[PDB]
Write a protein that binds this DNA or RNA. Structure first.
Ligand SMILES: Nc1nc2c(ncn2[C@H]2C[C@H](O)[C@@H](COP(=O)(O)OP(=O)(O)OP(=O)(O)O)O2)c(=O)[nH]1
Ligand SMILES: [Cl-]
Ligand SMILES: [Cl-]
Ligand SMILES: [Mg+2]
Ligand code: NA
Ligand code: NA
Ligand code: NA
Length: 326
DNA sequence: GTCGG
DNA sequence: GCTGATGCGC
DNA sequence: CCGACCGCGCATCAGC
């Protein structure tokens, strides 16, 4: 946690622009800056020194100068005093409440945690489960718990059919010692970019995991993306574990390396990598990397047979998952 | 809010 | 219903 | 200056 004071200021600035200002590029600006400063391996002693790194420009320069002087930023201090923005920031912490839902609720007087309980009638389903497990969803997961969760998922999956492969990605695959949640990549060989030979492929998995009582709730569920809740099982009169967020993404088996790249992340790394593809003249998503025509239209999928092939198309040296934390 | 063209 | 735009979350 | 800023799944709503 080297430059943590500066980086928390920028993350607090980014959350403001995102939740209150509804200014998604200001959000990404502060996020990039916070990311570049967090990877920089000295103690920033001046706003100008930070201005050297890309994505730290003039206005973040003044803000670093001030933070280094006072230990505060008064733009922030006053954002924290404003009760409209502080109520908006808080409501967005409920999964399913975004910036728009937050401001609407505040316009209706629903401002606090007890307000939300009074009015579970005015919530959609995702918002309800987000409120239900509001505290749990804010706890991290130690890696050790991730390892037991991995074992259940990989052993339950093997039972539905032995040809399912299931890869835990996200921060776990990047080597984190604690995780915000669990992210699971799922391949079955009967689902490729050329056919879906069997339906319910993802539904069977969600079904099996529900019946061992691992999956406990559902936020959203289509035929390739599940978004819900799980909980490790406890011993005899041991305290229950917190409930955990789990996403499971069924990707066509022949598109595994683009899928595993996407789900390993991080979100910022993905953004920077996909942006660099575009300046090199490629477009990357979770399925394919394609060349861009002389006009804008994306071409046809380039053949990929490892993660490193994707890095090589855009002329980056490969980076291990644990070096993709940005 | 930053940056590259 | 279907299509598309938006919110929200990755 | 000034526009472009990753890309997409699912839930939901408007409009036909
Ligand atoms: N292309 C893209 N991918 C994203 C974005 N957000 C998340 N992802 C991908 C990369 C993440 O590593 C992965 C899982 O999303 P998470 O929110 O769980 O992030 P991650 O697991 O890295 O962090 P965590 O420790 O769980 O909070 O999904 C995004 O805005 N764009
Ligand atoms: Cl691939
Ligand atoms: Cl594609
Ligand atoms: Mg995660
Ligand atoms: Na800079
Ligand atoms: Na939210
Ligand atoms: Na996730």
């Amino acid at each position: 946690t080297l430059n943590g004071g500066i980086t928390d200021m920028l993350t607090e600035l980014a959350n403001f622009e995102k939740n209150v200002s509804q200014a998604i590029h200001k959000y990404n600006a502060y996020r990039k800056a916070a990311s570049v400063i967090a990877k920089y391996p000295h103690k920033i002693k001046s706003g100008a020194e930070a201005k050297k790194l890309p994505g730290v420009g003039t206005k973040i320069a003044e803000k670093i100068d001030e933070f280094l002087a006072t230990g505060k930023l008064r733009k922030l201090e006053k954002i924290r005093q404003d009760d409209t923005s502080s109520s908006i920031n808080f409501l967005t912490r409920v999964s399913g409440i975004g910036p728009s839902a937050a401001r609407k609720f505040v316009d209706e007087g629903i401002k606090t945690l007890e307000d939300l309980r009074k009015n579970e009638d005015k919530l959609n389903h995702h918002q309800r489960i987000g409120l239900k497990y509001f505290g749990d969803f804010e706890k991290r997961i130690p890696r050790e718990e991730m390892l037991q969760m991995q074992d259940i998922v990989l052993n339950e999956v093997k039972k539905v059919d032995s040809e399912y492969i299931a890869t835990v990605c996200g921060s776990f695959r990047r080597g984190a010692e604690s995780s915000g949640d669990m992210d699971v990549l799922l391949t079955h060989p009967s689902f490729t970019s050329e056919s879906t030979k069997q339906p319910k492929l993802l539904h069977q998995v969600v079904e099996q995991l529900q019946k061992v009582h691992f999956i406990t709730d559902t936020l959203s569920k289509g035929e390739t993306k599940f978004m819900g809740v799980c909980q490790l099982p406890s011993k005899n009169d041991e305290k229950e574990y917190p409930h955990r967020r789990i996403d499971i993404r069924l990707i066509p088996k022949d598109q595994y390396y683009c899928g595993v790249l996407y789900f390993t992340g991080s979100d910022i790394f993905n953004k920077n990598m996909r942006a660099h593809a575009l300046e090199m003249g490629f477009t990357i998503n979770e399925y394919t990397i394609r060349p861009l025509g002389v006009t804008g239209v994306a071409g046809e999928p380039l053949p990929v047979d490892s993660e490193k092939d994707i890095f090589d198309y855009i002329q980056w040296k490969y980076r291990e998952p644990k070096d993709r934390s940005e």
